[PDB]
Structures are given as structure tokens and as C-alpha cells.
Subunit: 118 residues, 3 copies
């Protein structure tokens, strides 16, 4: 599929708790997992959010992975283990307090560089 | 299917959001969707640079992602509920609120190292 | 249908977002989509922690959700428009912008206590 993918993390954990290296690690790990070049992976981390999961304000995250292709039942299970693992290790968020929404984007529906990936 | 998540982005000030608002959203959404509250997630983002129709009046852009429980009649019910809460608690007119509803396939929601498929 | 909404998330600092940018996006999107500006919502989020291709140079991740007016040719036109505006006003290179396009079903957009069904 065309090369783009993007991963967003929204979390209540504080800015101070995001490791140096985290966005770079997300980029490299997602490139590897999706088979996409890192040049076309975008990552976005949003700490300090007002959020709750199950009515509790213990650490949690709501995430999205938008990808042109490379989305499906088995792949998404694999991404979830990878990404929950990174959020647990790096941000100290329990995997049972993380949702990740997966979106398979059509290339014609991803704009870039004044045009689209179609 | 257990999961649902509601996100509100708004231009109203942080100081205007009541202390119990996340808990109220959780409880109200659990009742509206029939899902246990244990698996409802909520997220409120105030102080945003955002306009509705070019105007700086209070407004909101929201999303409700749910595995199931999404459809024409249900979404109407959720809009009345959620616009009502945003009006009552955040003083946002319902005609300056959009809510995008997403019926998520269970295979497309990750949680706890796996997906809901 | 009247509704559309445009969201920009960017790592450019808040002080670099010019006065009047939300209004310009509203007017330009209204012209491009044929929708009245009164039902276009825009949302800009500066100072984000982002990387694009591993780099923290200026970049943006954006969404355009619209009832209708979404398709291959229209999206290419919107990308030229919106990348143009982000370059002109926020000094972001077009090759560091993604815009996700979503054609929303009217029944899945809540507004004013109901939906657009
Ligand atoms: Cl509850
Ligand atoms: Cl530029």
C-alpha cells in the first residue's frame, strides 16, 4: 500500500514523564511493524490530558493508528501488543487502561504535499 | 461488546469544566449505551483555538467511538443526551456542537495487548 | 449538506498562528466545498509534541470530516488549498503535512440535539 501511517497518543500522564527518545522509538517501532519507511511515519503524543477510563483517573491512554493498508485482524492484534508494551514500559500505563482505534485509510483519502497518495 | 469512548474538544475555559464532569459523562454514557462503565473512556479538552461558523461563541467538536450501539435512532438519542450535558455543564449551545459517531469493528479496537475481535 | 469540520494539530508554537487564521480557514473551506461558512467548524492545536519522518521540524496532522464533497479529485484540490494555507500562514512545508479525509454519513453526525439524517 502507499507509505503513510500516523500514530496518536492522548494520555493523562504528565509531560515530564515522557522519555526522551519516545517519539523516535514510536517511529522506528511502527516503521518496522508496518513495513513502511520511517520517512512516512508520523507520531503525536499529547500528555497532561483530562481523561478517565472506567471512571478512574489513574494513568490511561486513548490512541489512534491511521494507516494506508497494513490493517487487519492479525496485524491489529500484533500492533496492540507492541503499542501497549511501549506505553506500559515508557509511560507506565497499564495495558487494560489503553484503547487503540485502528483506521485503514484509502490512499485517495490521505492528503500530502499538495495532493494525495492516490 | 464492552468498549466505548467519548472525546470533547471545546473553546470554553478550563476553569469552566466542573470537577465531576468526567464521572458524569462516564455514568451517563454507560446508561445510554447499556455498556458497563468499567470500559467507558472519556476525554475533555478545553481552551481550544476553535470556531464554529467563524464565531468565537462557545462550541464543541466531539467523537463517540463504540463497538456497536451506533445507528440512526441511537445516535439521535446520544445527541440529545450529550448536547444537553454540554449545554448544562459547559454552557455550550447545542447548535454549536458537532458529534461524530463511529461504529468501530471489534477487530479495529485494541485494548489490553489484543483486540476485541 | 452543510456540515464539515477541519482540525489541524501542529508542533509550530502558538505565537506563530496568526490572528485571523481560523476565519481564513473557515472562508476558504466554505468556498472550496460550496458549504455555507456558518456550518464549517475549524480547530487548530499548536505546540504539539510531534514527529514526521523522525524529525521535529514543523509538521501537521490534520483531518477534514465532511458530509459529502469527499472523493479523489476533490481531496487533491483540498490538499493543494490546505497545504497552501499551512505553508503561507504557519510556514509548514507541504511535504510534512498529512490530511485525513472522512466522508461522514449524515446519520453519524450529531448536531443541535439530533443528527443530520
Ligand atoms: Cl460510572
Ligand atoms: Cl513552507
Amino acid at each position: 500500500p502507499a507509505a503513510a501511517a500516523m500514530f496518536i497518543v492522548n494520555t493523562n500522564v504528565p509531560r515530564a514523564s515522557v522519555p526522551d527518545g519516545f517519539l523516535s522509538e514510536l517511529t522506528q517501532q511502527l516503521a518496522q511493524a508496518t513495513g513502511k519507511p520511517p520517512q512516512y511515519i508520523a507520531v503525536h503524543v499529547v500528555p497532561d490530558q483530562l481523561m478517565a477510563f472506567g471512571g478512574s483517573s489513574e494513568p490511561c491512554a486513548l490512541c489512534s493508528l491511521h494507516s494506508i493498508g497494513k490493517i487487519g485482524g492479525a496485524q491489529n492484534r500484533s500492533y496492540s501488543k507492541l503499542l501497549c508494551g511501549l506505553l506500559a514500559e515508557r509511560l507506565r500505563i497499564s495495558p487494560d487502561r489503553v484503547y487503540i482505534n485502528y483506521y485503514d485509510m484509502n490512499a485517495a483519502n490521505v492528503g500530502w504535499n499538495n495532493s494525495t497518495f492516490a
